[PDB]
Subunit: 417 residues, 4 copies
């Protein structure tokens, strides 16, 4: 236990009475609306989202990085910190690894995970930066590089990520590359894409049949003119071309300004290529801010489509859920705690939508009541449900408050001078 | 002839000396660059773009419309005006019609076109507005409307456009609808798209063996929250789902801010679904401004992809070209003339690109020289080539100048009563 | 009463029990948070936003307009409909007129207003479209037109708006024009703005002592290359140049993609030039959608700045709030009703923010708790406060439900003839 | 000379014939247009833009940096490389320094510059990152930080930048900070701006009377929610507030999507606050790409506003011109060479505009001929003028060609340490 159980129990008891009052009131309110709060809490406590090992430490920009105290010094420290997030929120039992940043004896990683009560989500390859001893540079690309030997090297790296994953229980490989161009003419759009598809086909050939391959589109950065996998349209072509095991991953901050992302989510679901999500929030570009901190309604609307798919009869629908954020000016652990909470919040609210009523308003083209139907769910303060779900599962009623009362940050600051 | 042959000849003679000098000078510059100017001219004279019947009349915004003088009223007035653009530019032999706006006796339409030396490009359906006596309103959608009878009516209208097109020589139907929602929850994204696909499948069934069906995506407007056919991704799904005769149409101003449009073009080409292009320019949204008036380099880059597709003989590459613009503050005829000119200008420049050198710089990852290889082409003033092509084919050296010297606008202003 | 009181009473009685349970539950929660729900409700019931006369009629785009039934035939019908919104929401006692669309004898306008219990907010001039018998067209502009005779015509029109406003009780004139260019080179940016400043200086001379002149910026549309009053920067330059009576009006959907609108509001307030705010929502451009329907958090953040100004003891700050929307696919009256509710919703939430704690988190650079402090307020469902505020002031617990129960739309549908040409 | 004079001579002679043909051909075309090519060439060879000392090395993103061969180790190597750009293009006689990156003995800097034929442009302070042994961190801001001692430390740094500049011949200080917030509520927009203004006032007081203080606005990055100096509006307020010596710096890639940047330039000129420009190109955000590589027409339109002013008299109008780019996938020297060339290209084309004709089409509202009047100039290939200007002033006809023929990159690669990931 990263956080002393006595502290968790102490901070829960301190807020137990108020929570009971809020939960009961909400329970009565939902009962008046024909909803059993218990049924919602039950689903909420089972909603999980993977935390990024690379978000456990303070992030930075091309201009600077401002580390705080007790910065994790490696993957093992990072797992220790991730365990705090899980213990308190109970919403992040799995960690997403990134190779080579997190390279270490896989057996030891799995060992530290089991001890901490953490599992591992999809693996993440890295051919957007050069590692020491690398024969070919990814300066001008990786999986779509003009040099055959460079593409082969990139493929081998991804195959190595799969091997690592198999040793720790991972069942998927996420591939995001910076491949693209900064100048018109620098790259031939079609040939670069053909090269990418050929290299991804090789990775697919080496992909275990009990694994999935997620390709992640991004409009720009690091490439500032064109990017090979620029949007969901190219991403769909990729997944469809590679095979059933290949699906698309949607990072919320990777779209052009004003994009209707919830529609992209719906389209991918309809054609069975929605592999999963990379949650975060943003205002300008791929800001990688705490989920729901800028546009909480958009987050709700994305979950509205996920829940709608279930309501529509889509069977065995279980897209992968992962947080992909950068914490530049806050305690990384606190931001991850509240981000996971925010994701559960949007999910909970989506579960409250009166699907029958919404359906009737859509068929009758009553736009005002249709949108109001979504708002009645979104406006509902589900915090009592999120807190109770945590309390009932070993977490904290108020995670950040408990985290600070524990003095964990000061603790690791002393341990990690 | 809409414009007196004597005036065209006269306005050409007055500018022949300067054109001679510039063409020969450009010819020498290109020769030193290993390019035969005549070869470029040969291709430029064969590039055509369809003019929209709805473009020769003054356009407007939701706030107002400020008509000029001699405003064409019926499709007959419009064809007469479109004939001016073709005569002077020789780059717009075909006109794109819009139903019911241009609804008229097919036989009469065909006869008027033949008499003016004009053909007809793709038909354009209209289920984004209500016509008088219409049984079902398209307020809440058309092809994807929740009411079956409404979708049936929309489908029938499109089938009618196909019948009209067959009678006048058209070989395609372009479908752009405003279908979408203005509020979250108003529409179920998936079911709306299912209804759309189902209705489009019916239209597809009415397509003759040699016809194409073009679906056109648009991010927003008139729908301000979601749009069924919002982007090229959804558009590709439509084309792929419907079949070989279904392809995607790319309207330059229908993309999210900062979108790399030329890439979308390349992607559609690779997968054989680039049905055609709707040319115009823009800065903020679907501004529908004169092609090349805002971002001429972007236009060149789109053409760079088109010329490249040709150079490598890509399978199924044969997009239709059409201008889709609104002229709110200029003489519609002059704007279409110069827009058509800019389109040929961008094409001509793309033809100048040293493909062999570019390929080399691309393979060696010499980004600087690669972008410079494109710039050397784009920076070249190809006006002499465009002008000489027009001169040799019955057009005007300086189209707008000849148009103004002819006094055409004043002529039709006298024949067409202004509202005030 | 446009809506029968017995209908309002029956619908409120039908929802009394649920309202009581929710309001009291929320009240207890807020109490535990050290907040007096009574104090909030008292301020909410007093927050008003003007309704646009042109908003009760169905709107459209350049592609088409799909009118509903009972479209108002004129200003008098529009006033009648605005009376409905006010009666049910009690948040819209003042109406904003647009000339020449609402032109009519001022004495009659005033008479109908008083009869309905409505007042009049800022006047709105129209030089973005041509009126009949107009000696000069506004095709190439109005107040910034190259032709002096055209600018003079636009000035005289605005002066007329001021005269009408004076007779009905208005105290401000809002000026939004489409002036701009669609092509590079078409206009000399500087000279066009200089011409605009000249015309506005003239309009300014006709302002009574207690009147305000509001200039409204817009990035684009109807102009698609450049716009004279394109952003808040140019807008500030205008207000500062004209004088103490000149201030800037911020319309939510008039900004470039991703703009931080709430910051612009803070800036204008800091320099005493925030005249008013036109409320609406949008996702792509100037969509003019129902306020809070697309980005409710942004609306809350805008109010956060408004409330913070009062928190920083800003002096002489009395912004004019107005709804400026277009209802293309809904009953205009219903949308204005829920939009006004949304606006009060965001205001209520902003009042819930613990400024003391927030200021503390800001000082210590505790970004996480600072943003959470705002979220604790935004996440709060204040609907019971909004409903109780309505009940107390003679409004409806559920405005739209009550509106539909009254059969108002079908009633006016049989009294108003649509257009046939 | 960084590049052997015989190499420059040989590479010019090899292209002299074709250049003569192109220049005379263009000369004849311009004559037919009533334009004297000699008058244009004379102005072109006198147009200069400062080069960023930090743009000489390979740039990177937050994801990675892929340095090339012969990366400059310090300011002295950077100066040596900037000398290549100036010798070959003759358009970059001054270098802009960044402190503490280029911290060095002022006398050695001045000596090296004088020996290389290079001067120094505006100084650039750095309070957007922490340096070793720094007492206070700029993590939560600098000039607007909530901590008084942190603001004081930031102010002192800028004053030190001024001292260094006075010793080497600089006459301006450019201030760009990342100050802002990543979360709503983290910062109080108004208070933070007030702190920024107070700190800048202290820097202004220490500014020599013959110097200029340039504030640079940026919409976002590194701050991802709000930025203190986010746009030209706030920037104008800063400059006007600080005083006559304070002006606004416009960086092309620092504006919201679809912003009409050329209008901003016009507005700043109109109110005498256009301090200067930071040239670069972009498609998505502050991409910092080679000038004119993405939107050459936008670059021309900006120069159109500059030349219009230049032509319409406007005394004492000497905006500072600087290139601010990051070269992540090309030889930094080559990109700066072609970028400076592109900048002169836009200027030359702007000089070709028939101002009288344009004025006429604007006053007549002949939008089409107005835009075509600009296009006639923009469509003209002025490369012969740029090349001849270089040839006549000791530069190279084809800069990059000569640069490569000289084998300079291979040369410095062998004189400098190898770079790592
Ligand atoms: Zn991601
Ligand atoms: Zn990302
Ligand atoms: Zn179109
Ligand atoms: Zn359009
Ligand atoms: Zn407005
Ligand atoms: Zn507006
Ligand atoms: Zn800069
Ligand atoms: Zn920058």
């Amino acid at each position: 236990f990263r956080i002393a159980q006595d502290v968790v129990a102490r901070e829960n008891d301190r807020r137990a009475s108020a929570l009971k009052e809020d939960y009961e009131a909400l329970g009565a309110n939902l009962a008046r609306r024909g909803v059993d709060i218990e049924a919602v809490t039950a689903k909420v406590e089972k909603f999980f989202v993977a935390v990024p090992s690379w978000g456990v430490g303070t992030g930075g920009t091309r201009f600077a990085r401002f580390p705080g105290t007790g910065e994790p010094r490696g993957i093992f420290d990072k797992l220790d910190d991730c365990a705090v997030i899980q213990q308190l929120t109970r919403a992040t039992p799995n960690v997403s690894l990134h190779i080579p940043w997190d390279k270490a004896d896989p057996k030891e990683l799995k060992a530290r995970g089991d001890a901490l009560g953490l599992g591992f989500d999809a693996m993440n390859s890295n051919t957007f930066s050069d590692a020491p001893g690398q024969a070919h540079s990814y300066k001008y690309g990786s999986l779509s590089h003009t040099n055959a030997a460079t593409r082969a090297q990139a493929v081998e790296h991804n195959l190595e990520c799969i091997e690592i994953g198999k040793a720790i229980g991972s069942k998927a490989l996420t591939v995001w590359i910076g491949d693209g161009s900064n100048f018109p003419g620098q790259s031939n759009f079609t040939r670069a894409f053909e090269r990418y598809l050929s290299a991804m086909a090789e990775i697919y050939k080496g992909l275990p049949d009990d694994w999935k391959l997620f390709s992640e589109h991004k409009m720009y950065e690091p490439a500032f003119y064109s990017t090979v996998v620029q949007d969901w349209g190219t991403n769909y072509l990729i997944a469809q071309t590679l095979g059933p095991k290949a699906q698309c991953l949607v990072d919320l901050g990777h779209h052009a300004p004003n994009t209707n992302i919830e529609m992209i989510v719906a389209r991918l679901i309809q054609f069975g290529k929605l592999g999963g999500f990379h949650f975060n929030d943003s205002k300008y570009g791929d800001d990688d801010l705490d989920a729901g901190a800028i546009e909480p309604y958009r987050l709700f609307l994305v979950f509205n489509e996920l829940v709608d798919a279930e309501a529509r009869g889509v069977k065995g629908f279980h897209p992968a859920h992962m947080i992909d954020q950068s914490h530049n000016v806050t305690d990384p652990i606190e931001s991850l705690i509240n981000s996971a909470n925010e994701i559960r919040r949007a999910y909970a609210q989506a579960l409250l939508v009166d699907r029958a009523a919404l359906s009737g308003y859509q068929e009758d083209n009553d736009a005002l009541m249709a949108t109001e139907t979504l708002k009645r769910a979104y406006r509902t303060d589900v915090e009592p449900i999120l807190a109770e779900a945590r309390r009932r599962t070993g977490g904290a009623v108020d995670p950040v408050a408990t985290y600070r009362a524990s003095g964990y940050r000061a603790r690791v600051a002393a341990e990690r001078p």
